[PDB]
Design a protein around this ligand. Structure first.
Ligand SMILES: *Cc1ccc(S(=O)(=O)N2CCOCC2)cc1
Ligand SMILES: *Cc1ccc(S(=O)(=O)N2CCOCC2)cc1
Ligand SMILES: [Ca+2]
Ligand SMILES: [Ca+2]
Ligand SMILES: [Ca+2]
Ligand SMILES: [Ca+2]
Ligand SMILES: [Cl-]
Ligand SMILES: [Cl-]
Ligand SMILES: [Mg+2]
Ligand SMILES: [Mg+2]
Lengths: 9, 235, 235, 9
């Protein structure tokens, strides 16, 4: 299950 | 932190650190920017979030590797290896908890209380839910339940505001629902709540896509695909 | 460093850190193991080398990103951005130099002087060449020439020993020649020396492959391919 | 030009 990757602006 | 550096210089260096994939530096720069005491712009909030998500993302990946090795060592027929695996998992776990506490401290002092607009307040409350969720992933003692309820409460307040104040296709509203659904499935042992939330979020966004420009359509459909990917895995 | 932890526990945790991709931890554990004062086994030398190569590898990649941004800022028609790019490049550069100095300090106190076997002595001297080469990559002042000669001298002593004491297919001998050829091409402005070294190394290894087992053949041909890849790029 | 990757034991 994937959350928001959120690792690139 | 970084008290002698100008706010604008901290922001500029956070962007440079992101380009150099130096996420610990990026987080320290953005922590310094927050501690200047001024509210954060939309772009600045994203930099703060990206920085700490990368830092804790690496810690969580390491913790999972070590927890898996530790669990195998405690099975039947396993040769006693000593305290080293547990000790090192505990070290990584303590470092991860420290980063989560640092982010939660920034939100509590004083990002959330000064966030009056829906876009800023929902963004910070989603962060609060996320970092309590990361604490919940490693929690095993007398406060696992309280940590879970802290995550749930933050996510719930963000959801209530986002439903009242944002369109169903708003990327922050969509990412909040995505992560809250992951919370339901992975943390709260409520897979049916997770599936229902993801489905309703996807369907209500789909019905609102007609209002969007080409660029906004791209932003919203990208996150809708993540909701669909989870539903495919969960059903 | 890590004075209260057992040598065997440091080694065990260095292996766990590698599995968790926690290379800073891995390097600190192996630094502690070295400072116990006992010589290192073949496997332990590899752990030390892997740990610091990953740490300095990330620093070098970041330094190159920032140096490129800095060079563009100092071109014609570029808008003045302030001291931030230079300051942050300098910060990363200083951290990188500190790691190289730390490794060189471990080799000097006292890994190299206690390394009597060809396999250990060549391994450490190759490391010494590598970390002076990394210092040379960022050097611009009064000691760039001295740093380059320190790298050359370490590589040359390792080469002399490896030619006398190891077969032409030995993976450490091959990796040493590969890196020395990179030194010639990238640092010493001697591309013809780089090409000649890579070619002679490849041809003499090829002629020795018949002596090897299936597993040793795989180890040697893997590094021979790297020599060929460079020759393809250089010619 | 590639040196030894040397980042995996
Ligand atoms: C939590 C979350 C939600 C959405 C996004 S994003 O779509 O990638 N985007 C939102 C605002 O502008 C830039 C990032 C990230 C995180
Ligand atoms: C510098 C160098 C040379 C060779 C190697 S390796 O072939 O990957 N191998 C050598 C000894 O045993 C394990 C690693 C690494 C570095
Ligand atoms: Ca100021
Ligand atoms: Ca406000
Ligand atoms: Ca002991
Ligand atoms: Ca000896
Ligand atoms: Cl530990
Ligand atoms: Cl800086
Ligand atoms: Mg609105
Ligand atoms: Mg021999």
């Amino acid at each position: 299950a994937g959350s928001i990757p959120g690792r690139r602006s | 932190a970084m008290g002698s550096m100008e706010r604008a210089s901290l922001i500029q260096k956070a962007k440079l650190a992101e380009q150099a994939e130096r996420y610990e530096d990026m987080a320290a720069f953005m922590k310094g920017a927050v501690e200047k005491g001024e509210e954060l712009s939309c772009e600045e909030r994203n930099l703060l979030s990206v920085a700490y998500k990368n830092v804790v993302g690496g810690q969580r990946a390491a913790w999972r590797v070590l927890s898996s090795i530790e669990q195998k060592s405690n099975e039947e027929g396993s040769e006693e290896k000593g305290p080293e695996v547990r000790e090192y998992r505990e070290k990584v776990e303590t470092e991860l908890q420290g980063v989560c506490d640092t982010v939660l401290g920034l939100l509590d002092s004083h990002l959330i209380k000064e966030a009056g607009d829906a876009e800023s307040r929902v963004f910070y409350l989603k962060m609060k839910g996320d970092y309590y969720r990361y604490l919940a992933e490693v929690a095993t003692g007398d406060d696992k339940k309280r940590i879970i309820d802290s995550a749930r409460s933050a996510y719930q307040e963000a959801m209530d505001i986002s439903k009242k104040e944002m369109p169903p296709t708003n990327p922050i509203r969509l990412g909040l629902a995505l992560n809250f659904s992951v919370f339901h499935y992975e943390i709260a042992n409520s897979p049916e709540e997770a599936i229902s939330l993801a489905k309703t979020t996807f369907d209500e966004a789909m019905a609102d896509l007609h209002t969007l420009s080409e660029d906004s359509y791209k932003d919203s459909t990208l996150i809708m695909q993540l909701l669909r990917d989870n539903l495919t895995l969960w059903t």
